[PDB]
């Protein structure tokens, strides 16, 4: 009956990471940035709009009900705990404007989430697309543009889900600009490319990690100022091991065990500077986790939102942009010159804010 906000934070992040694994499997050798927490948060909003079997499919996948006493407040709390000027987010559901909505739903949604279900006239397609893109752009400090692309919606669209995040955290200890140098990055297909790489000598939190098959990985922690967020960087020791070996067994809990086993070793780290932007179409990932009804006409149950007309999700999309740089203000080597996993984590709650694979910086 009573659960500390860490409970939902782990379920949310666990589910978010499972969605990431589906995305990572679908884009084997491409860059991906993604927010496990972001997709959990927006799917929690979608739980409230849905009914019956559509709702159950989402609850079975996420492992909790947004209706339950304690949940809505805990998420609200979590959001406050997590979130500035280096991080900005927005969650939004847009539904066709003249559709009769269930009595009391909009105030009820607002009470549980402190944001509104947006109403728009999709039959004026470009106006509708502009309004949605303007909402997203203005609630990510102008960093996420054109989230909803030309052709993504049309005259017959009735419901659209949107999630967007921008991250540009500044590391606690900066990389000296003068040590930034061009160096060969080895891509998964055997080819190389010369890219700007940062270098820093320091005592880094570090652990080795060995999978059940015997291959091992270097895992470094790079704290951010604020002493609460950290980026974890992970790559196989051997050049020939694919990064998917790691991503196919990733969990929120595994990452906590990594942190648990770390000690501060003195190392020269060489890490590529990168700036990645990705739009994930969430449909196939979520379908693969059992949430199939919501995307299907005359199957989806959105009777909590409207019990007047049928409804289904036309688009569920996340767009994230992450930037990693020297972070400046006013000895054995670890070289990340091969594809690597990164994880941005909030260490008190264990929340996974961001996850990605850098296949080519």
């Amino acid at each position, epitope marked *: 009956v009573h659960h500390p906000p860490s409970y939902v934070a782990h379920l949310a992040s666990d589910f978010g990471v499972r969605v990431f694994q589906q995305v990572a499997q679908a884009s084997k050798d491409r860059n991906v940035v993604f927010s496990p927490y972001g997709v959990a948060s927006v799917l929690a909003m979608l739980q409230l709009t849905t009914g019956g079997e559509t709702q159950q499919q989402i609850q079975a996948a996420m492992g909790f009900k947004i209706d339950d006493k304690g949940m809505a407040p805990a998420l609200r709390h979590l959001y406050k705990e997590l979130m500035k000027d280096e991080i900005s987010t927005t969650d939004a559901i847009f539904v066709q404007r003249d559709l009769k909505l269930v009595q009391g739903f909009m105030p009820h949604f607002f009470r549980l989430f402190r944001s509104t279900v947006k109403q728009v006239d999709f039959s004026e397609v470009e106006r509708a697309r502009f309004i949605i893109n303007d909402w997203v752009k203005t609630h990510t400090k102008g960093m996420i543009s054109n989230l909803l692309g030309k052709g993504a919606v049309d005259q017959l669209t009735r419901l659209v889900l949107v999630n967007a995040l921008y991250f540009n955290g500044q590391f606690k200890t900066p990389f000296p600009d003068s040590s930034t140098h061009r160096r060969l990055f080895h891509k998964s297909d055997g080819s190389t490319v010369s890219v700007p790489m940062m270098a820093q000598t320091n005592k880094f939190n570090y652990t080795e990690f*060995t999978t059940p098959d015997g291959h091992y990985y270097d895992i470094l922690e790079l704290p951010y100022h604020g002493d609460t967020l950290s980026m974890f960087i992970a790559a196989p020791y051997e050049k020939e091991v694919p990064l998917s070996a790691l991503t196919n067994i990733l969990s929120a809990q595994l990452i906590s065990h990594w942190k648990g086993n770390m000690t501060r070793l003195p190392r020269l780290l060489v890490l590529p500077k990168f700036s990645l932007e990705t739009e994930v179409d969430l449909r196939k990932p979520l379908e693969n986790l059992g949430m199939t009804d919501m995307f299907r006409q005359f199957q989806a149950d959105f009777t909590s939102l409207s019990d007047q007309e049928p409804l289904h999700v036309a688009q569920a999309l996340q767009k994230v942009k992450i930037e990693v740089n020297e972070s400046g203000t006013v000895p054995e080597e670890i070289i990340m010159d091969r594809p690597f996993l990164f994880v941005v984590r909030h260490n008190p709650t264990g929340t996974v804010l961001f996850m990605g694979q850098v296949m080519e910086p």
Partner: nanobody
Amino acid sequence: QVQLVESGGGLVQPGGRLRLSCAASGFTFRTYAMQWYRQSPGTERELVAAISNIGGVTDYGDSVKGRFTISRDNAKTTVYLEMNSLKPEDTATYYCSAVRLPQRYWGRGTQVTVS
């Protein structure tokens, strides 16, 4: 100096259970994966169970079907294989192995017999 000594094997009836154990020494246990293999007269060594060095990531052979659980204690440099719902098909010598590639060590095995 490296040693892997398995114990806990024996005779049981169908539907019986056993807890295998392997004490390890002579290497940095905490950085190695631990594995269990089985072999009976006239067949190859088949992977039964595998665990990561930390985090408890596991892998199981097809015919285990959630009947066997692999665990480990790094402070005691020991690895365990809890086996339940034993069948005549499980009759074999069970070998513990430690691996951090390309280095692999083997134990002597311990016999599991199911009538």
